[PDB]
Design a protein around this ligand. Structure first.
Ligand SMILES: [Cl-]
Ligand SMILES: [Zn+2]
Length: 70
């Protein structure tokens, strides 16, 4: 599998699907979110991408901690 920094936009869509965060795929793709963006996303970016529910941002924050060992 690819290092995260090399994830294309669809690779991020696949990852979101895998997290049962599929309803965010279109926003992440329409906003040009690739693997290089994931380490840099702030809460305000996740809000701008339509991730308005606390639980769903916490799911993304949790997943990224394990992906990027932060
Ligand atoms: Cl949400
Ligand atoms: Zn959501």
């Amino acid at each position: 599998t690819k290092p995260v920094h090399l994830w294309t936009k669809p690779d991020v869509a696949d990852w979101l699907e895998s997290l049962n965060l599929g309803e965010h795929k279109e926003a992440f793709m329409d906003n040009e979110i690739d693997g290089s963006h994931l380490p840099n996303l702030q809460k305000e970016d996740l809000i701008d991408l339509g991730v308005t529910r606390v639980g769903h941002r916490m799911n993304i924050e949790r997943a990224l901690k394990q992906l990027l060992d932060r």
